[PDB]
Structures are given as C-alpha cells and as structure tokens.
Design a protein around this ligand. Structure first.
Ligand SMILES: COc1ccc(-c2ccc(S(=O)(=O)c3ccccc3CC(=O)NO)cc2)cc1
Ligand SMILES: [Ca+2]
Ligand SMILES: [Ca+2]
Ligand SMILES: [Ca+2]
Ligand SMILES: [Zn+2]
Ligand SMILES: [Zn+2]
Length: 152
C-alpha cells in the first residue's frame, strides 16, 4: 500500500512547481479513497514514473502528435509498469486553455494503479477529456468501486 512516484521530467508548457502540484493533487485524489500512501521522490527508483515525451518514446506505444491520444499509462509492475506518460505535443495546463494536467493525471494514475476504462461518463476513468473546475472535480462512484476493488 505504499507507492513511490517520481516526475522524470517537466513539460515546458507549465511552471515546474505547477507540474509538481498537479501531480501531487492527482495522487491525492486516489489516496483519499483508498489505503494507498504515495511518496514523491526526486531521484531514484520509483514505482510510478511520470514522463512527458512525444512520438516514439521507448515503449512500443508511440504518441501521435497534437491531439488524438493525450497520454497513457501502464498498470502496476516492474520497470515501465505503473508509469504514466503524457504526450508533449499537447499543451498541458494548470486549468483550461489546453489539456488540464491534473485531470489527465487522475485518469492516468488510475491506469497506473490497475484500473481500466469505465463505461460511466461521470467516471474519471471514462476515456473522454472534459474540463471541469478542478475544485469541484470528484471521482464517481464507479471510480471508487474500481479502485477499492483492488486496494483494501
Ligand atoms: C475528467 O478528466 C479526464 C478524463 C479522461 C481523460 C482522458 C481521456 C482520453 C484520453 S486519450 O488519450 O485521448 C484516449 C482516448 C480514447 C482511448 C484511449 C485513450 C488513451 C487513454 O485511455 N489513455 O489513458 C486520455 C485521457 C483525461 C481527463
Ligand atoms: Ca497526441
Ligand atoms: Ca514503474
Ligand atoms: Ca507541450
Ligand atoms: Zn509511453
Ligand atoms: Zn485511459
């Protein structure tokens, strides 16, 4: 129940502190509904690596340029397992005006922890990006069902 994460690199779209905050808040969403304890590391071997990259980036799932696929993430495992990759050809944002990193990271971390996609459009795990005010964002009951089915 104790999972480490590291931010490999920072999108130039955002301030470094804003990337840190968005990612920290995204892990907090999942920690708030599970026994999971997440610890950020700055250097070293983490369970979950966060990476921004474009096109082909070393995993056999190349990105596709601006638009299309925004991000993907691997389920829990050794190596690339757990990692969450964000397509740098998107414009990552703290709020709107691009693709919101926090919301996207909530979705990807879901996959990092072993979740698939939901058929509930209110779930963060439903694979349609839609901006919502970050302060009013809430996991759906379907997301909570999924994650609690794995942890606890
Ligand atoms: C509410 O906040 C949200 C909800 C959903 C996502 C989300 C939605 C879609 C995608 S995507 O990369 O375009 C995509 C679209 C369809 C099928 C697969 C994918 C890849 C994917 O599911 N990555 O996790 C990636 C992230 C992002 C943020
Ligand atoms: Ca893309
Ligand atoms: Ca990993
Ligand atoms: Ca970018
Ligand atoms: Zn990748
Ligand atoms: Zn997804």
């Amino acid at each position: 129940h104790y999972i480490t994460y590291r931010i490999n690199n920072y999108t130039p779209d955002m301030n470094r502190e804003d990337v840190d905050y968005a990612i920290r808040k995204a892990f907090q969403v999942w920690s708030n509904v599970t026994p999971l304890k997440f610890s950020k590391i700055n250097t070293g071997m983490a369970d979950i690596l966060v990476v921004f990259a474009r096109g082909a980036h070393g995993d056999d799932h190349a990105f596709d340029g601006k638009g299309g696929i925004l991000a993907h993430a691997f389920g829990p495992g050794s190596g690339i397992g757990g990692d969450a990759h964000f397509d740098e050809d998107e414009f990552w944002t703290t709020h709107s005006g691009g693709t919101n990193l926090f919301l996207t990271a909530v979705h990807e971390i879901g996959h990092s922890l072993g979740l698939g996609h939901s058929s509930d459009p209110k779930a963060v795990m439903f694979p349609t990006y839609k901006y919502v005010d970050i302060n009013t964002f809430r996991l759906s009951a379907d997301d909570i069902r999924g994650i609690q089915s794995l942890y606890g």
